[PDB]
Design a binder for this molecule. Structure first.
Ligand SMILES: NC(=O)c1ccc[n+]([C@@H]2O[C@H](COP(=O)([O-])OP(=O)(O)OC[C@H]3O[C@@H](n4cnc5c(N)ncnc54)[C@H](OP(=O)(O)O)[C@@H]3O)[C@@H](O)[C@H]2O)c1
Ligand SMILES: NC(=O)c1ccc[n+]([C@@H]2O[C@H](COP(=O)([O-])OP(=O)(O)OC[C@H]3O[C@@H](n4cnc5c(N)ncnc54)[C@H](OP(=O)(O)O)[C@@H]3O)[C@@H](O)[C@H]2O)c1
Lengths: 286, 285
């Protein structure tokens, strides 16, 4: 009961359009590569010939593109067709690029919402699916239901860049943690321990991290009471990891980066504070 | 019952000695700072007057010291008393330093078990604690007393293995903690409290349920890159670097991740699964 346009027919976009179509929403679609639409048009989507047609076809225009450079390459030549439309950009990019695009959309008559999808293309439309949303609350509340088709709707604030900040911070946890798991698996692997043999121990390590609330409370108070886990303690242990990694013939760049941050914080006088104090150097460029 | 000596009465050694004592073992203790044994001695522990008498008091000698340098400083002047003893070094150090110490102990007639303790001092004695052990399987099998401290997790004969497993677990711990704090600082740049983002970060960690598929890929050495290629990850890491830069936060951690992705792409893995990054992590630059 709401027309929807989907610019961007990549794995993600195709999934969104299909979910919109399977929810019964009128769906118009466009893509630099039309062949990517043959499937949805066969399922009942309208392949627009131009970007202008797609934009006019619906007020709600959801964008799933590689990056914002792609958006501007698509939409700028049709910028005079953006008036009245609501652009919901779900493409990954920087917060600042989102705040710049929001201003660009405004000057061209369009409203702008930023979105960060937290599921793979296949996950779109499942209970585990949720999308960070930021921008004008009224515009969000006006199109929440339509967007819920794709997954949970999580409005995080008015700043257009906030949704992407949340997304980037989550991927910052993800990729860095994945690299740590691979580095540790390589370390034990240097003595012939299969990855599937270390997996139980790695898995239980992550289940042991049930104290993040305490750390978050420390950060939010700006107080890092030392007690059972000084930063100096972690610094000594990180040195053992660096030295073990070297001895084992594996890469040392990752543990060395962690070590240098600990040294920064100790030089700043947090050695006796809780290791949460490390955030104080993480927030300050060296 | 079965005597046990504990050398090193810092927070961990004090907790280990207490556990042995509460479990009914005869316990002899030694520490460079003797005041730290007072509370234990008041409960039945024997304060050895000399390191060598501590070694002689029990065949099983548990060491809980800062590093292996502390061990040699303590034990070398008394190396002739190591004969017949079983040294169980629960001190954190490198796998190579463990192998070296095992050879030194054998030169003095002592057997050697390496241990890696995966709980803080308050965690000793819970059945939910565990300790990696490596060294002669017959020596580990003969020394029930160790279970007083927590689970006994024997990883093999190589004396370096227990510390290898331990350093790898701590590798995950500290790097993941650094990532959590950096990401928390990133959203905090715009005033999002850590306690508001934590629910989302917790979901992230609870969503890591594919590590098995990664484990099988590593063991096969096959990194089928179809769904999530390394190139796609690198592009995401670049946005993270740039967002961190724009936010005024330190970029060293994300730049370190970015450099590893670049190395893997330069090794031909751009279109492989992100697990292929292990091929650069297994080899120095
Ligand atoms: N799970 C996820 O994959 C996920 C999660 C969160 C966010 N995102 C964001 O959503 C995007 C889309 O998901 P994806 O990675 O599956 O697909 P993708 O490969 O990034 O496809 C992006 C889309 O952008 C289009 N495009 C790129 N450059 C263009 C240009 N110069 N002119 C016109 N169109 C251009 C592509 O058209 P063609 O099809 O013709 O190449 C394609 O439809 C991601 O790149 C990311 O930015 C994805
Ligand atoms: N959460 C934890 O505390 C924890 C958890 C798991 C593993 N570990 C590991 O277990 C070991 C024990 O740690 P801990 O918590 O007890 O604190 P610690 O400060 O590492 O232990 C200090 C102990 O080592 C002794 N020592 C240090 N340098 C010495 C030297 N040069 N000569 C003689 N004795 C020396 C101290 O003697 P004095 O007491 O006389 O000063 C004391 O008995 C460490 O290797 C640590 O990495 C700790």
């Amino acid at each position: 009961n709401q027309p929807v346009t989907v610019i961007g027919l990549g794995p993600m976009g195709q999934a969104m359009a299909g979910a919109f179509l399977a929810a019964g929403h009128p769906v118009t679609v466009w893509n630099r590569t039309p062949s990517k639409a043959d499937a949805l048009v066969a399922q009942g989507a309208v392949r627009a010939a131009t970007v202008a047609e797609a934009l006019a076809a619906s007020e709600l225009v959801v964008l799933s593109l590689t990056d914002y450079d792609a958006m501007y390459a698509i939409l700028e030549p049709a910028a005079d067709a953006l008036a009245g439309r609501v652009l919901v950009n779900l493409s990954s990019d920087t917060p600042e690029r989102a705040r710049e695009a929001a201003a660009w959309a405004a000057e061209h008559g369009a409203r702008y919402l930023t979105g960060g999808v937290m599921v793979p293309p296949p996950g779109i439309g499942t209970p585990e699916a949720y999308v960070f949303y930021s921008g004008p609350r009224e515009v969000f509340e006006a199109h929440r239901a339509t967007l819920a088709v794709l997954g949970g709707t999580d409005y995080v604030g008015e700043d257009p860049g906030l949704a992407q900040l949340y997304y980037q911070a989550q991927l910052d946890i993800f990729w860095t943690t994945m690299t740590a798991y691979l580095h540790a698996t390589a370390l034990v692997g240097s003595e012939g321990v299969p990855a599937e043999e270390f997996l139980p121990y790695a898995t239980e390590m992550f289940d042991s991290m049930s104290f993040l609330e305490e750390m978050a409370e420390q950060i939010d108070a700006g107080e890092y009471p030392g007690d059972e886990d000084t930063l100096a303690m972690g610094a000594a242990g990180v040195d053992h990891i660096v030295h073990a990694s070297r001895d084992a013939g594996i890469d040392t760049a990752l543990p060395e980066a962690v070590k240098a941050l600990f040294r920064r914080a100790i030089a700043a006088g947090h050695g006796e504070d809780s290791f949460t104090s490390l955030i104080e150097v993480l927030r300050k460029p060296a």
